[PDB]
UniProtKB/Swiss-Prot annotation:
Effect annotated for changing G30F: Almost complete loss of enzymatic activity. The enzyme is destabilized by 1.5 kcal/mol
Keyword entries, A-Z: Antimicrobial, Bacteriolytic enzyme, Cytolysis, Glycosidase, Host cell lysis by virus, Host cytoplasm, Hydrolase, Viral release from host cell
Organism superkingdom: Viruses
Induction summary: Expressed late in the viral replication.
CDD domains documented for this protein: T4-like_lys
UniProt-recorded name of the protein: Endolysin
Result for mutant: E11N: Loss of 84% of enzymatic activity
Subcellular localization: Host cytoplasm
UniProt source species: Enterobacteria phage T4 (Bacteriophage T4)
Predominant subcellular localization, coarse grouping: host cell
Known catalytic reactions: Hydrolysis of (1->4)-beta-linkages between N-acetylmuramic acid and N-acetyl-D-glucosamine residues in a peptidoglycan and between N-acetyl-D-glucosamine residues in chitodextrins
Active-site feature positions: E11, D20
Outcome reported for the amino acid change (mutating N132I): 5-fold decrease in enzymatic activity
Gene transcribed to yield this protein: E
Length: 164
């Protein structure tokens, strides 16, 4: 398992504009287009992202390209963030995928807000971090994915994604 396969399982793949769990216009593999309620604004953002008149639909190749760009950005974001980098530097490869997953979903800012959990992760207090991460809107709104990610931080293995 790797970050791409992981996110692909959590985000799925849709080639037509859709609304995510929060109701925001999205496409491809969880690529957020806009928080605005206007479908036209989304269509505009899509064309700008792809470089052509898409009329709300893209190809699989286009979806994968946006995906590579998004994973790269999430990684770069972590590495430039003063609160996130130290955590990332402290973790093993499997657990860092869980951190990338969160950033991909909630953004750098959102993740930087889990101050307490972040400190527990840095200290390698896995079970404690797991409980703390669960006390969040994130866990209450998307419990299945949150459990997978949390199990990943807790065990340092891919068990939660095996058999999916
Ligand atoms: Cl809570
Ligand atoms: Cl979920």
């Amino acid at each position: 398992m790797n970050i791409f396969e992981m996110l692909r399982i959590d985000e799925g793949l849709r080639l037509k504009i859709y609304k995510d769990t929060e109701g925001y216009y999205t496409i491809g593999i969880g690529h957020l287009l806009t928080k605005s309620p206007s479908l036209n604004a989304a269509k505009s953002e899509l064309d700008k992202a792809i470089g052509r008149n898409c009329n709300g639909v893209i190809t699989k190749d286009e979806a994968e390209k946006l995906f590579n760009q998004d994973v790269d950005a999430a990684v770069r974001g972590i590495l430039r963030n003063a609160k996130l980098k130290p955590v990332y530097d402290s973790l093993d490869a499997v657990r860092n995928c869980a951190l990338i997953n969160m950033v991909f979903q909630m953004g750098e800012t959102g993740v930087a807000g889990f101050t307490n959990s972040l400190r527990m992760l840095q200290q390698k207090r896995w079970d404690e971090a797991a409980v703390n991460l669960a006390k969040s809107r994130w866990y209450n709104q998307t419990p299945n994915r949150a459990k997978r990610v949390i199990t990943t931080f807790r065990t340092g293995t891919w068990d939660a994604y095996k058999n999916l």
